[PDB]
């Protein structure tokens, strides 16, 4: 029976402890003292204190390897963030007789390298953003910028050939892709075959942090869907992918797409796909790591144009925001069509060592119309009673009532452009 | 846009507010003053105080009709309990231009009368429990013809000589031993009928359900198909509209007997919802407003339709003070339906139900569901009132429940054992 070391904390470590229990396996959690009131502590079958201090304590690869040895772990689940994309760490697990819950280290190395992941995309016919592939010839950043014809470029954002030398100095030539949606494809594999759980749309972002994530992508034509999934399946198949991974794209209004990132791990938003599709991704992920087939783990091996599930779901990230305080009242929404993934209980004082996430609220219904889903999600959020720390709950409600979200007339820059209006609107919910 | 008067309170009234909302419709809630801390007050689009007191307040038919008139309601949802089986009330709604969310009043009468419903089952070939107008010389004659098997009087006698002494404290029927409680969920649009398969509610404390399973664990398909086909006969026969449940006792070899037709939503609709991936209450409302099964998203399907994969169970968390801490479980595979929030003081005018906890998984093996259920309940933080949480845990860990080697008399027989056991979980 596996003994799974959860090399992570917070809402993901809780998540993992619940999939481990569902399998009849055992879990070993780790914690830093400033994290000790976290639900992931109590929820493990056994929790092991780290001698490190902060976020640092969870990133000490050799410390985690000591924990694993000392407590007879067989498997290491890195969750997301921390060491989930660290190929050396995966190697070191492998070396110590531990199975890393993730693809092979060579695949970690590949998808973690901008230049190798691009070249792979290019060799398979998968479009990528126009850019400088490596280094940056740099007086010429101007030359590529001149080749973009007046269109803006990201290093900072450079809009004029004149502004380049000065903006550049502040601190690698990519075309700025404007008016696009962020659409990503969930993959799974067993090392022989690959499959998919369709898509998610994570377009509503605040300085590149995702706030609202939708499965399906609203108002997406099937032809674009089947193309996105086909691209993702080609990437995964080419590396003989094992376990879970997500392939991220920017998609223009007319359905052009650009491969932007391969995340070779579980993601925060895996929850929306779970509730839309009626599937447990994390038990599947664990079983795939332990050597079962897609068919044995209960994932259908399906083509890119497979008809998507009916219904719809959205996840909202509830954040503390910044600030401090001890959590005094904390009573997340529940009941039909709502699911909440957290680590927070009453009397917790969150530590600034860790990100601002307090809870993820997933809302799901079985009809197709977006406005009805947004109304349901706003209601569920309005039932979230938090006292003692400040949150984004009003801001989430302003998002969910905004017309442009109601028609999904959105791009990845939508929110940053409208931040003052949205902050005004949020005071009606405060 | 309909405005639905919710003639009820507590968790079901919150349930119905949620379904009305999903539809883009409007709710009007009602409450007695001592119930004003309930979630169903604030969760409704508009809430109205009753001038009655406690439970009585909610049973005042004419008062409710006055609320409906004054607030321009169009539909009345009676939930379950209270006036949900009251045919006179249903008639009165219709008279006042309010659509009663449930079947026609002639069906409420029929299914509310033991002798008419027995009679219907009999005409249709559906077995009913042997039984009896009393006369002690009808009771003792029946007891004899049962050749020594026990018998119940209602509305428990083991020996002929024990009868008359026992009698006075009425009709008589065979006591059905070693049976499971299996019930079939029906839905109709008045033209056609369909089902969402079965539930098992065998674990009972003096006839009060505590754990309710969908599907019925370790049920042969042949027995499923028969149960469903019997229920579908009963419902097609009355051209049933809306939701209704047909309950049976089932022997270990698969004999079954019709025991009750509940022509309404039930408390344990929630387990079927999670197992099947269906919203029964929005269907029910749409069905009451005259859409077809098809139009409301319900497959019209035969008795032998293959059941959905996975499994689900509901546990009823009961107060059995002021609620100082209330933090229900959550996360993947759990759903909690309540009305309670921190600082509510429960009124002893209303039943002991605090929360329904529904746990759902997509594999087949029962012990793993039980384990999941137990772990969810261990996360339920309640302070200020006493609950049945530890008791519920002892149920979930018991080997007989793990093997589903149960009957409707199982818990009652083992109550001291289980009460001992529960002590380990607090």
- Whether A22 and B381 lie within 8 Å, measured CB to CB: no
Rounded to whole angstroms, the maximal C-alpha distance in chain A is: 64
CA–CA gap between residue B57 and residue A166 (Å, rounded): 76
Q: Do B325 and A335 touch (CB under 8 A)?
A: no
A330/B327 CB distance under 8 A: yes
Residues with Cβ within 8 Å of residue A230, at least 6 apart in sequence? A304
Block residue for tokens 């589903």: B404
Distance CA B403, CA B387 (A): 26
Q: Across the interface, do B336 and A336 touch by the CB < 8 Å criterion?
A: no
B402 touches chain A (CB under 8 A): no
Q: Per the structure block, which two tokens stand in for B72?
A: 């321009």
Please confirm whether the linkage preceding A216 is cis (ω < 30° from 0): yes
* For testing contact with chain A, the best of B14, B22, B354 (most A CBs within 10 A): B22
A115 to chain B, any CB pair closer than 8 A? The answer is no
**Domain A177-430 CATH superfamily:** ATP-grasp fold, B domain (3.30.470.20)
Instruction: Tally Cβ neighbours within 10 Å of residue A187.
Output: 24
Planar angle of CA B170, B176, B182, nearest 5 degrees: 110
Interface test with B, best of A335, A365, A369 (most B CBs within 10 A): A335
**Site of tokens 């309601």:** B73
Per the structure block, which two tokens stand in for B265? 């939503």
**Beta-carbon count within 10 A of B299 CB:** 13
Residues A112 and A90 sit within 8 Å (Cβ to Cβ): no
How far is residue B342's CA from residue A408's CA, in Å, rounded to a whole number? Answer: 37
Contact A278 B375 (CB under 8 A): no
Q: CA-CA distance, A149 to A147, in Å (whole number)?
A: 5
**A22 and B368 in contact by Cβ < 8 A?**
yes
Identify whether B215 is preceded by a cis peptide bond (ω within 30 of 0): yes
Nearest to A238 by CA among A113, A90, A123, A108: A123
Report the CATH number of the A129-176 domain.
3.30.1490.20
Cα separation, B206 vs B198, whole angstroms: 22
Which of these is catalytic: A9, A15, A200, A265? A265
Contacts of B278 in chain A (CB under 8 A): 366
Q: Chain B residues with CB inside 8 Å of A375's CB? A: 21, 24
What is the architecture of the domain spanning B1-128?
A: 3-Layer(aba) Sandwich (3.40)
Gaps in chain B with C–N over 2.5 Å, residue before each: 132, 155, 169, 320
Q: Which residue of A has its CA nearest to B273?
A: A336
Token look-up 């409007």 returns: B26
d(CA A68, CA A87): 18
What Å distances lie between residue A23 and A110, A290, B193, B336, CA to CA?
31, 12, 39, 23
Residues of B in contact with A280 (CB under 8 A): 332-333, 361-362
How far the first Cα of chain A sits from its last, in Å, is 49
From B265's Cα to the closest Cα of chain A, the distance in A is 15
Chain-centroid distance of CA B362 in Å reads: 24
Whole-number Å distance between alpha carbons of A22 and A286: 11
For residue A380, the chain B residue with the least C-alpha distance is: B18
In chain A, positions 148-177, which contact chain B (CB-CB < 8 Å)?
A: none
**Separation CA B168–CA B188 (nearest Å):** 42
Q: What is the 3-state secondary structure (H, E, C) of chain A?
A: CCEEEECCCCHHHHHHHHHHHHCCCEEEEEECHHHCCCHHHHHCCEEEECCCCCHHHHCCHHHHHHHHHHCCCCEEECCCCCCCCCHHHHHHHHHCCCEECCCCHHHHHHHCCHHHHHHHHHHCCCCECCECCCCCCCCCHHHHHHHCCCCCEECCEECCHHHHHHHHHCCCCEECCCCCEEEEEEEEEECCCEEEEEEEEEEEEECCEEEEEEECCCCCCHHHHHHHHHHHHHHHHHCCCEEEEEEEEEECCCCCEEEEEEECCCCCCHHHHHHHHCCCHHHHHHHHHCCCCHHHHCCCCCCCCCCCCCCEEEEEEEEECCCCCCCCEEECCCCCCEEEEECCCCCCCCCCCCCCEEEEEEEEECCCCHHHHHHHHHHHHHCCEEECCCECHHHHHHHHHCHHHHCCCCCCCHHHHCHHHHHHHHHHHC
Closest C-alpha among B112, B39, B45 to residue B73? B45
Considering only CB atoms, A335 lies closest to which of B278, B332, B336, namely B336
Contact between chains at B331 and A15 (C-beta distance less than 8 A): yes
Structure token pair of residue A112: 């973690």
A330 to chain B: nearest residue by CA? B327
In angstroms and rounded to an integer, the radius of gyration of the C-alpha atoms of chain B is 22
Interface test with A, best of B11, B27, B332 (most A CBs within 10 A): B332
Tokens of B367: 């012990």
- Distances, alpha carbon B38 to alpha carbons A386, A421, B10, B31, in Å: 19, 36, 6, 9
Q: Where are the domains of chain A?
A: 1-128, 129-176, 177-430
Residue A342 touches chain B, beta carbons under 8 Å: yes
Burial class, B424, CB count within 10 angstroms (exposed 0-12 / middle 13-18 / buried 19+): exposed
Of A24, A282, A385, the CB nearest to B368: A24
Which of A111, A81, A107 minimizes the C-alpha distance to A94?
A107
* Token digits of residue A339: 């699911």
User: Which residues from A are below 8 Å from B42, CB to CB?
Assistant: none
CA B41/CA B365 separation, integer angstroms: 40
How far is residue A264's CA from residue A249's CA, in Å, rounded to a whole number? Answer: 15
Which one of A336, A341, A381 would you mutate to disrupt binding with B, by most B Cβ within 10 Å of its Cβ?
Answer: A336
- Residue of A45, A48, A47 whose CA lies nearest to A26: A45
CB A26 within 8 A of CB A16: no
For B303, the token pair is: 């008795």
Q: How far apart are CA B205 and CA B207, in angstroms?
A: 5
Q: Spell out the residues 6+ positions from residue B3 whose beta carbon is closer than 8 angstroms to its own.
A: B25, B26, B27, B28, B45, B71, B72, B73, B74, B75
CB-based contact A199:A218 (threshold 8 Å): no
Q: Which residues pair with A27 in a beta bridge?
A: A4
Provide, as residue numbers in chain B, all residues whose Cβ is less than 8 Å from the Cβ of A338. 335
B176-426, CATH topology level: D-amino Acid Aminotransferase; Chain A, domain 1 (3.30.470)
Chain A, window 265-284: residues with a beta carbon less than 8 angstroms from a chain B beta carbon: 271, 274, 278-280, 282
Please enumerate in sequence order all residues whose Cβ is within 8 A of that of B241, keeping only pairs 6 or more positions apart, or say none: B103, B104, B188, B189, B190, B287, B288
Closest by alpha carbon to B261, among B91, B85, B41, B381?
B85
Cβ distance B371 to A342 less than 8 Å, yes or no, reads: no
Nearest beta carbon to residue B336 from set A18, A334, A365: A334
Whole-Å CA distances, A356 to A11, A318, A345, A391, A392: 11, 8, 15, 9, 10
How far from the centroid of its chain's Cα atoms is residue A126's Cα?
22
Solved how? Answer: X-ray
Among candidate residues B58, B3, B55, the one with its CA nearest the CA of residue B30:
B58
Q: Count the Cβ atoms, other than its own, within 10 Å of residue B94.
A: 14
Q: Cα separations (Å) of A289 from A97, A235, A265, B7, B356?
A: 14, 19, 12, 53, 36
CA distance from start to end of chain B: 49
Quick one: closest CA in A to B326, which residue? A331
Among partner residues B297, B335, B371, which is closest to A336 by beta-carbon distance?
Answer: B335
Of A271, A282, A372, the CB nearest to B22: A372
Alpha-carbon distance of B185 to A32, in angstroms, equals 50
| 3-class SS string, chain B | CCEEEECCCCHHHHHHHHHHHHCCCEEEEEECHHHCCCHHHHHCCEEEECCCCCCHHHHCHHHHHHHHHHCCCCEEECCCCCCCCCHHHHHHHHHCCCEECCCCHHHHHHHCCHHHHHHHHHHHCCCECCECCCCHHHHHHHHHHCCCCCEEEECCECCCCCHHHHHCCCEEEECCCCCEEEEEEEEEECCCEEEEEEEEEEEEECCEEEEEEECCCCCCHHHHHHHHHHHHHHHHHCCCEEEEEEEEEECCCCCEEEEEEECCCCCCHHHHHHHHCCCHHHHHHHHHCCCCHHHHCCCCCCCCCCCCCCEEEEEEEECCCCCCEEECCCCCCEEEEECCCCCCCCCCCCCCEEEEEEEEECCCCHHHHHHHHHHHHHCCEEECCCCCHHHHHHHHHCHHHHCCCCCCCHHHHCHHHHHHHHHHHC
State the count of interchain CB pairs (< 8 A) between A and B: 90
Residue with tokens 């599937």: A279
Across the interface, of B277, B297, B332, the residue whose CB is closest to A274 is: B332
Structure tokens at B282: 């929005």
Task: Give the CA count within 13 Å in the CB-facing half-sphere of B410.
Answer: 21
The B residues from 347 to 376 touching A (CB cutoff 8 Å) are 361-362, 368, 371-372, 375
Identity of the residue in B18, B332, B335 whose CB atom sits nearest the CB atom of A280: B332
Give the span between the Cα atoms of A181 and A136, in whole angstroms.
27
Picking from B295, B184, B289, the residue whose alpha carbon sits closest to that of residue B241 is: B289
Homologous superfamily of domain range B129-175:
ATP-grasp fold, A domain (3.30.1490.20)
Has A175 been annotated as catalytic? Answer: no
CB atoms within 10 A of CB B132: 15
Q: Mark which residues 286-305 of B lie under 8 Å from A by CB.
A: 297
State phi, psi for A405 to the nearest 5 degrees: -75, -45
Task: Give the residue from A159, A134, A16, A183 showing the smallest Cα distance to A84.
Answer: A16
Q: What is the pairing mode between strands B311-318 and B3-6?
A: unpaired
Q: Report the C-alpha gap between A189 and A244 in whole angstroms.
A: 7
Option in B277, B330, B338 nearest A340 (CB): B330
């Amino acid at each position: 029976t596996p003994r799974v070391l959860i090399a992570n904390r917070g809402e993901v470590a809780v998540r993992i402890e619940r999939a481990v229990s569902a399998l009849g396996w055992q879990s070993v959690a780790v914690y830093a003292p400033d994290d000790a009131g976290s639900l992931h502590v109590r929820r493990a079958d056994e929790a092991v204190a780290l001698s490190g201090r902060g976020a640092a304590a969870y990133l000490d690869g050799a410390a985690l390897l000591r924990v694993a040895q000392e407590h007879a772990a067989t498997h290491v689940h890195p969750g997301y963030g921390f060491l989930s994309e660290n190929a050396d760490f995966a190697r070191a697990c492998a070396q110590a007789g531990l199975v890393f819950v993730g693809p092979d280290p060579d695949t970690l190395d590949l998808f973690g390298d901008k230049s190798r992941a691009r070249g792979l995309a290019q060799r398979l016919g998968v479009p990528v953003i126009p850019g400088t592939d490596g280094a940056t010839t740099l007086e010429e950043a101007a030359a590529f910028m001149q080749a973009q014809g007046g269109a803006p470029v990201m290093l900072r954002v450079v809009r004029q050939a004149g502004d380049l030398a000065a903006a550049f100095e502040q601190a690698y030539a990519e075309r700025l892709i404007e008016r696009a949606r962020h659409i990503e494809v969930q993959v799974a594999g067993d090392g022989q075959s690959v499959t998919h759980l369709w898509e998610r749309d994570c377009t509503v972002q605040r300085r590149h942090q995702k706030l609202l994530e939708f499965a399906p992508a609203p108002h997406l034509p099937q032809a674009v869907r089947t193309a996105l999934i086909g691209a993702a399946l080609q990437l995964a198949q080419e590396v003989k992918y094992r376990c879970l991974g997500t392939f991220e794209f920017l998609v223009t209004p007319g359905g052009d797409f650009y491969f932007i990132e391969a995340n070779p791990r579980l993601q925060v938003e895996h929850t929306v796909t779970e509730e839309w599709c009626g599937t447990d991704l994390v038990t599947a992920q664990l079983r795939l790591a332990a050597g079962e087939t897609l068919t044995a783990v209960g994932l259908a091996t399906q083509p890119a144009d497979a008809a998507p599930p009916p219904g719809q779901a959205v996840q909202a990230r509830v954040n503390m925001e910044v600030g401090g305080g001890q959590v005094q009242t904390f009573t997340p929404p529940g009941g039909p069509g709502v699911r909440v993934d957290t680590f927070v209980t009453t009397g917790l004082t969150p530590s600034p060592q860790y990100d601002a996430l307090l809870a993820k609220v997933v809302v799901h219904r079985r009809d197709a119309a977006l406005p009805g889903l947004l109304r349901q999600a706003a209601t569920a959020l309005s039932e979230f009673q938090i006292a003692g720390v400040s949150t984004n709950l009003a801001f989430l409600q302003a998002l969910l009532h905004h017309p442009d979200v109601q028609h999904y007339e959105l791009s990845t820059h939508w929110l940053d452009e409208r931040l003052p209006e949205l902050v005004t609107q949020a005071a009606e919910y405060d």
